[PDB]
Amino acid sequence: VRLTPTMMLYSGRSQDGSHLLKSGRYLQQELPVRIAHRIKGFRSLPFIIGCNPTILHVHELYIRAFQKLTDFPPIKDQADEAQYCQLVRQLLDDHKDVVTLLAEGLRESRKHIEDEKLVRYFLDKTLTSRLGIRMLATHHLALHEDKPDFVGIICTRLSPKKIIEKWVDFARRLCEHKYGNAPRVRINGHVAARFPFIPMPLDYILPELLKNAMRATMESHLDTPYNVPDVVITIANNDVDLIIRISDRGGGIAHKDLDRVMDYHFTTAPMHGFGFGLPTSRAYAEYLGGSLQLQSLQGIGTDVYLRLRHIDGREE
């Protein structure tokens, strides 16, 4: 139905809860293959990195997950599909702090290091496979519920302005709690657009980009925390993609850091996180068929351009 990388999100012709069985069976044939690929990923990690405790723990979670998934019998009826949903849920929860554990595990290993680009390739490949598995899984689960304007995790009439505002309020609150104020965010462009879209990736990316913009703005206006320049977001909606530009007046990204900011762990900083925001968002966007580009005006501010392809057709 709705495609993305090579994964499919089924648009269920409901009826006699029949579509659910077709989706459960798909999910059941898909998850163990994706889990195995990531186990191969841990097996090929440099020995010294792979021997790190936390990394081993995560490696063991993936083996365990592969085993429970492999041991569940083929879904034959509603009775099965329903217990499978309990398995999927237990796994999503068990793997809740995986990105966090990976970042910690890998943080130390590269005092010890290997092939400069070797780890980035590993984290890009692991984080995005994770996203895709969670999208598949969350979508099957959601196909049970009946939420207005959704087919599973797919919103049928998503408003970019509305999802942006949701994350603006969130980020502004993290920022006010920390600095006592937060820049206001103005939104322009196609503010009335509504189209079929999956909001999950935007739910990770948008708050990461807004956190970066608000902090850089606050950190560069220490003399007047009570009066800082607005962050400005422009929405461009065309038949090919959705573009969201986030411009701040927070001083820009220094020429001396420009080439490091897209590296996992790199950071200039607790609100910010742990240097994963940008490299993760870009991996996610490219995984989905879009991109994330930065334009730095050193001494003035930064423009961040997020592009995501529309479902599998154009759109207004």
Ligand SMILES: Nc1ncnc2c1ncn2[C@@H]1O[C@H](COP(=O)(O)OP(=O)(O)O)[C@@H](O)[C@H]1O
């Ligand atoms: N909009 C921005 N303006 C200024 N600096 C930014 C901006 N976005 C990101 N950066 C810089 O890039 C670094 C990397 O950011 P990121 O990967 O999100 O990690 P973190 O926020 O946790 O440091 C930041 O620490 C900061 O130096």
Ligand SMILES: [Cl-]
């Ligand atoms: Cl092992």
Ligand SMILES: [Cl-]
């Ligand atoms: Cl195995």
Ligand SMILES: [Cl-]
């Ligand atoms: Cl999408």
Ligand SMILES: [K+]
């Ligand atoms: K970084």
Ligand SMILES: [Mg+2]
């Ligand atoms: Mg960040």
Ligand SMILES: [Xe]
């Ligand atoms: Xe899962």
Ligand SMILES: [Xe]
């Ligand atoms: Xe998982």
